[PDB]
Amino acid sequence: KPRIDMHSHFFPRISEQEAAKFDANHAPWLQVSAKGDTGSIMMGKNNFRPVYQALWDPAFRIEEMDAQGVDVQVTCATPVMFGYTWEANKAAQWAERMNDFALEFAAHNPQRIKVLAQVPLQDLDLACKEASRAVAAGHLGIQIGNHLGDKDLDDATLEAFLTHCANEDIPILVHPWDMMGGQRMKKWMLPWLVAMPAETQLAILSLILSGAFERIPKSLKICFGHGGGSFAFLLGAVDNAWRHRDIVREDCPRPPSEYVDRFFVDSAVFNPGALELLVSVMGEDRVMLGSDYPFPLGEQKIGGLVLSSNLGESAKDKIISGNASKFFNIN
């Protein structure tokens, strides 16, 4: 009965100088304070984001896992590490470097710390190669961003990558990143509060409404971060539009809501009513506990929202433990 958190991030101890060998402007690296308790993710010379020790230090993280009653945590790249805009070969080198750093992180206690890998998604062949290599090396799966510029998950290159993983039994976490919105949502974390749930919804609907699930083998294990964004709540409007508009039916042979048996979501929706609706839509077998640790907006008491919810007790057990153990093949 291990309590599993499957949505969490790490960032490796990369020096400015090493990041500079990749991109002096765009490669992230880590600056650590004096006391050693805090630091910032950097981009060239700019502060990109303040972080704390649990992000880069597995010893310290274990102690906090202990304090949260978290038995096993799955952790993956902070999305700033993706490098989807870089020249392909440099990005494939970078992913291999990041993925080895992840394995060194997990090696502190690989019974309790599991890792997912990143891939150079801008090149299908290198991405498939890196996925297979990383999983054979000990990663339990891959974390990708939800889009690659104007390419959403329905794009042939992304569908091909998903198919590869399906065929190789490689589970996928899809994480929103590089949020839409441009110039109008630049205050009060609006891109996190508005653009990010829209991104995740869009990625899910791109697979559904393009008929991608009719081409991708049922073996695909794929989870969408952050509760699937606004997907659960907006699904009625999607089923309605599908029934009453031809251009919505065009490539999708079944009502959209039926495809929920093809994917998973995490539980990070920050409200009992919201989580109940999510479980109602997805089914108790397809929601996994994830906290977004160790980021500020990560769940303060991991699993607390699930245990406070009105859900059945077996549904609670599945969300806290059972569903992830199965999804990521943890024993």
Q: Which does 24 bind (CB under 5 to 8 A by kind): Zn ion, a copy of itself, none?
A: none
Residue 221's contacts (CB-CB under 8 Å, 6 or more residues apart) are: 141, 166, 169, 170, 171, 172, 264, 327
Q: What are the φ and ψ backbone dihedral angles of 216, each rounded to 5 degrees?
A: -85, 130
Q: Which does 68 bind (CB under 5 to 8 A by kind): Zn ion, a copy of itself, none?
A: none
Nearer to a copy of itself by Cβ, of 21 and 184: the residue is 184
292 labeled binding residue: yes
**Minimum CB distance to a copy of itself, residue 180 (Å):** 5
CA angle 306, 312, 318 (to 5 degrees): 60
Q: What span, in angstroms and rounded, lies between the C-alpha atoms of 294 and 298?
A: 6
Question: The tokens 């806290």 sit on which residue?
Answer: 320
Cβ–Cβ under 8 Å, residues 216 and 163: yes
State the residues that interact with a copy of itself by CB under 8 A.
Answer: 147, 150-153, 180-185, 187-190, 192-195, 197-198, 201-202, 205-206, 209-210, 226, 230, 232-241, 244-245, 247-248, 250-252, 269-271, 273-274, 277, 280-281, 296-297, 300
Cβ–Cβ under 8 Å, residues 327 and 6: yes
**Minimum CB distance to a copy of itself, residue 44 (Å):** 23
Alpha-carbon dihedral 43, 45, 47, 52, rounded to 10 degrees: 80
What the block records as the tokens of 72 is: 């096993």
Nearer to Zn ion by Cβ, of 292 and 299: the residue is 292
State the residues that interact with Zn ion by CB under 5 A.
Answer: 292
CA–CA distances in Å: residue 115 to residues 3, 142, 289: 16, 9, 16
Residue type, 110: P
Examine residue 294 and say whether the peptide bond preceding it is cis (omega within 30 degrees of 0).
Answer: yes
Nearer to a copy of itself by Cβ, of 41 and 238: the residue is 238
175 labeled binding residue: yes
**Minimum CB distance to a copy of itself, residue 184 (Å):** 4
Nearer to a copy of itself by Cβ, of 112 and 249: the residue is 249
**Which is nearest to 294 in space by CA: 76, 6, 52, 33?**
52
Q: Which does 251 bind (CB under 5 to 8 A by kind): a copy of itself, Zn ion, none?
A: a copy of itself
Q: What span, in angstroms and rounded, lies between the C-alpha atoms of 56 and 73?
A: 14
Q: Which does 292 bind (CB under 5 to 8 A by kind): a copy of itself, Zn ion, none?
A: Zn ion
Residue nearest to Zn ion (CB): 292
Nearer to Zn ion by Cβ, of 75 and 210: the residue is 75
Nearer to a copy of itself by Cβ, of 23 and 292: the residue is 292
**Minimum CB distance to a copy of itself, residue 270 (Å):** 4
**Minimum CB distance to a copy of itself, residue 299 (Å):** 8
Q: Is 119 helix (H, G, I), strand (E, B) or coil?
A: coil
7 labeled binding residue: yes
Q: Which residues are annotated as a binding site for Zn(2+)?
A: 7, 9, 175, 292
Residues contributing to the annotated binding site: 7, 9, 175, 292
